[PDB]
Symmetry: C3
Subunit: 214 residues, 3 copies
């Protein structure tokens, strides 16, 4: 069982937008940014952290900081999960296939890293699409280490109620003194407008710059 | 709204249109890093607002080429005599937005005045569409939080969705230039690489050449 | 003469991707685009010295990669998943005077010369034909379109009907100078049922290699 609360649509300043983005104007949208990871990378090295759980956790912290990232339709109602957990890809080198695992979120990165590294240790070699099953309150992260993309765009055949956010990380590279990571984010318009993604991406850049590991 | 109904039998894109309305139907999104170096310097030196200045160049381009003005009206494909920019207004206090259209005019200064009136009169109204929506719009959306390398719109139902959608990003310095992320979504039935590329080459031009009159 | 190409039926029961393929043909069905600024510095120099047209030459490189890896060569044929023996580039041709376009396929060969002579005939015989598909369409093609107007940082295709749409789509943009490099926008759309991030990335890393290592021969 998982906690949620209910959006009151008749009182919401997005009532009209939600109603249209749920019917005649339904749409999802993707955007890519070359994210500045110079500081964050130095940090992850300084502390001997694995890049990937560290990045997944800053995203998870953001999904867990604004309610527009945690929306679902539940038995006909718009709801906001009290938390969301990251569901991230793991690559199997031998079969050339992937799985998605999810790890329980906590604010303290240290506590999350321990749960993550444990999840990878027990389920990493399990070749199921979803070794742990899937839960209803997650968001997606995938690592695409081969390609320093300028664009990454998802075209999901059925977007009905697909409100979980989907992030895709690209291969970081050098650009003068910086390390730039390509970062794409797909969201559904019924639950995020440009303002939500934009504030999130700004706070993500900032957090990457100011977090001090641990 | 006046229009011209297309003579399909004589149209060189007859088979295209027909494939792009059924079996091959599709939409496509493109982003470019527009160079607004000269455009911005023009805007500041003449104390214009950037957004209506840009909307107006978008809006001249859509009104110079018919592929941007097509629509399906009562089972017939039609070209509008003109199309009117439908642009976003952000409400900082509720963190929501509205989509407002302003009557296009050729002269910039006529346009800026209808735009200023529109935004003064309806800019606090929180309706999704404060003026409702008319048949002949194209869409312009502003995104100044993000200097994106890609913006991509995936509409669930693209049937007869012929109205172009531009999405503007956060401009930035690079070397000595000012670049601005600019994306365009079109439907394949009414525009091909060429029509979108010609358009974008013209945009770049009209920006480097605009005089502020 | 016609070439009817051979194929192999996929035993889905021995395929490591079976669970995925079945999710991505139903509840998770999706497609995805990605764009790269391809580094074409060595390739363009090679092309200029040996006086080739750029397009047929790039198309041939793409063709070689689609024909090096079976995930690019899948199709549903009479209700069954199959790998084509090989696939042929179906590429665009721009008609200046009507401002229209066609899609033309040319039969693939391993050897550039063989291939450049096929492409040149096709382009001379059909280059002016205003038909959407001057040569019709055959069952085992991949797509390439040239988009020489625009140096995009993104291009992506949103197909309304993706069922069984397994043929890769490539889009090339207008090349440009970045310091000493010559870069070219290159985008690829694939269907997730037959390609994962790994397939597509391996391919794009190989495409770069091949572009830098090509000898005009
Ligand atoms: C086919 C389709 O779904 O297009 C939808 C999608 C639409 C192009 C459009 C109206 C407008 O807000 C749009 C904005 C620019 C508004 C602000 C930015 O967020 C966008 C990134 C955004 C994308 C698409 C969009 C959402 C649509 C309309 C027109 C409006 C009509 C009604 C009844 C609400 C539509 O139904 O046609
Ligand atoms: C509506 C839709 O198609 O979303 C689908 C699509 C889905 C978002 C998703 C689960 C997950 O792998 C996804 C990944 C991130 C996984 C890794 C990267 O490759 C991506 C490029 C990728 C894109 C979409 C995707 C494939 C879906 C789910 C969640 C549960 C998965 C299953 C099989 C039930 C879903 O159907 O809800
Ligand atoms: C699944 C789908 O909608 O793919 C459609 C979409 C299609 C891939 C394709 C044939 C071809 O021109 C295409 C081009 C490359 C041609 C030139 C470029 O403009 C585009 C960047 C472009 C995008 C998609 C596209 C339009 C399709 C076909 C091919 C079969 C033949 C006909 C007559 C429709 C199709 O339906 O199979
Ligand atoms: Ca919180």
């Amino acid at each position: 069982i998982t906690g949620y609360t209910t959006v009151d649509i008749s009182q919401w300043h997005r009532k009209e937008h939600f109603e249209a983005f749920q019917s005649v104007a339904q749409c999802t949208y993707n955007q890519t940014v070359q994210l500045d990871i110079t500081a964050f990378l130095k940090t992850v090295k300084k502390n001997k952290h694995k890049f990937y759980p560290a990045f997944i956790h800053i995203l998870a912290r953001l999904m867990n900081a604004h309610p527009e990232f945690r929306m679902a339709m539940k038995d006909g109602e718009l709801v906001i999960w009290d938390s969301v957990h990251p569901c991230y890809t793991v690559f199997h080198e031998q079969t050339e296939t992937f799985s998605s695992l999810w790890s329980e979120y906590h604010d303290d990165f240290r506590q999350f890293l321990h749960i993550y590294s444990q999840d990878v240790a027990c389920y990493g070699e399990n070749l199921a699409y979803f070794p742990k099953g899937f839960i209803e309150n997650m968001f997606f992260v995938s690592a695409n280490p081969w390609v320093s993309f300028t664009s990454f765009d998802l075209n999901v055949a059925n977007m009905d109620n697909f409100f979980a956010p989907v992030f895709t990380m690209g291969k970081y590279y050098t650009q003068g003194d910086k390390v730039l990571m390509p970062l794409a984010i797909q969201v559904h318009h019924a639950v995020c407008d440009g303002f939500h993604v934009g504030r999130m991406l700004n706070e993500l850049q900032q957090y990457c710059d100011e977090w001090q590991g641990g």
